């Protein structure tokens, strides 16, 4: 699945750079120019989500009490609550990925850095597996860039 691959690449890249605190310059080897644009939009939108819901994100992180691999494995049951109500839109998808970045940031500080990759594939799992048809209909990562374009 090229979409699973491309989404995993973008998401894993965004979560890894968020835990690090500094943005990379090296190229994306699968995603392409679509992935470059997708990651750039995700950086602008995702950071504007993380700031606008900073208190709510801090509270959710505290309440979740993530400290080990079992907690990271169970986080998939929390991820589905973003789609639980039958609502699917780019606004929900960005929030799902922005919080993923917040968790990844927490996992790095609490020295559980090896659990970031498992989390990134879990976000991609819930996205690409439960919402494939909608993503493809919405023109995947191109539609994502087109939807959030402001001008």
């Amino acid at each position, epitope marked *: 699945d090229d979409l699973y691959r491309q989404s995993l690449e973008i998401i894993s890249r965004y979560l890894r750079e968020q835990a690090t605190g500094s943005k990379d310059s090296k190229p994306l080897g699968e995603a*392409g*120019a*679509a992935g470059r*644009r997708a990651l750039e939009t995700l950086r602008r939108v995702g950071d504007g989500v993380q700031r606008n819901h900073e208190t709510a994100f801090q509270g959710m992180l505290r309440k979740l009490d993530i400290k080990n691999e079992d907690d990271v494995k169970s986080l998939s049951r929390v991820m589905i609550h973003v789609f639980s109500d039958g609502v699917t839109n780019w606004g929900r998808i960005v929030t799902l990925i922005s919080f993923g970045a917040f968790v990844a940031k927490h996992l790095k500080t609490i020295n559980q850095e090896s659990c970031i990759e498992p989390l990134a594939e879990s976000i991609t799992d819930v996205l690409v597996r439960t919402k494939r048809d909608w993503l493809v*209909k919405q*023109r*995947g*990562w*191109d*539609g994502f*860039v*087109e*939807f*959030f*374009h402001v*001008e």
Partner: antibody
Framework: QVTLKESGGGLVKPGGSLRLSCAASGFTFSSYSMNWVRQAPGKGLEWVSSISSSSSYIYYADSVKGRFTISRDNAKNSLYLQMNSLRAEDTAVYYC????????????WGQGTLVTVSA | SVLTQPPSASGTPGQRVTISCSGSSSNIGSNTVNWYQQLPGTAPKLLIYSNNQRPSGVPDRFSGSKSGTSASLAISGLQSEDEADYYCAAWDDSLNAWVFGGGTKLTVLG
């Protein structure tokens, strides 16, 4: 001034090929899905083809599948339509239309370019 | 065409005219409907987007609605300047294509 201007339309023989071009101005072209819509004189609008911002998602009407090829050059703010194996029924004014990211409405249209398929 | 519209519509000045657009579950039933106005000898222009939203410049007289697999365009206060071809359009999920209605030619009589 946000504009779209089609070019390349003209007389072509049945079985022939023609390339239409559409120049975008005043906006960030690489952040929009684009469309071709045609209209036979005195007849209705018929959507032809669509291409996403990074060319990852391409669509065609059944009436044009295997004969028309849509593509775009984001560096040249250009949309193209390579039409091959042209028949009388392809005679129409071809429009270029920008698609809104959030609603999918075709907010900007070009003035159109006439293609006449005749011997 | 996949979306059907009455070929023609008519009314007198000031009357309220209605133009229907009939589709299926995979087009109007799954997606928003847009309307285009094509004045004689002009390129089409966006009239209505998201079923009932008006772009800047479209007067209050135009309104749209959607229910089930059908959509409707309502022109209150018919004027001679409303004489045009009206088209509805919706994305179709089962075809992976945009479907335009056949078009409605509006004549303002009387």
């Amino acid at each position: 001034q946000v504009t779209l201007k089609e070019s390349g339309g003209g007389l072509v023989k049945p079985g022939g090929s023609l390339r239409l071009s559409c120049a975008a101005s005043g906006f960030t072209f690489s952040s929009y899905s684009m469309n071709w819509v045609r209209q036979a004189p005195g007849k209705g609008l018929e959507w032809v083809s669509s291409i996403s911002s990074s060319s990852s998602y391409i669509y065609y009407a059944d009436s044009v599948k295997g004969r028309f090829t849509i593509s775009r050059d984001n560096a040249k703010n250009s949309l193209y339509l390579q039409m091959n194996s042209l028949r009388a029924e392809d005679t129409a004014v071809y429009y270029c239309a920008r698609q809104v990211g959030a609603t999918w409405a075709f907010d900007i249209w070009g003035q159109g370019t006439l293609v006449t398929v005749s011997a | 065409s996949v979306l059907t519209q009455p070929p023609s519509a008519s009314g007198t000045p000031g009357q309220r005219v209605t133009i229907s657009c009939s589709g299926s579950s995979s087009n109007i039933g799954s997606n928003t409907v847009n309307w285009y106005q094509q004045l004689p000898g002009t390129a089409p222009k966006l009239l209505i987007y998201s079923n009932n939203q008006r772009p800047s410049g479209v007067p209050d007289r135009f309104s749209g609605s959607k229910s089930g697999t059908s959509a409707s365009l309502a022109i209150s206060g018919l004027q001679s300047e409303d004489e045009a071809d009206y088209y509805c359009a919706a994305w179709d999920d089962s075809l992976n294509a945009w479907v335009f209605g056949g078009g409605t030619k509006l004549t303002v009589l009387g």
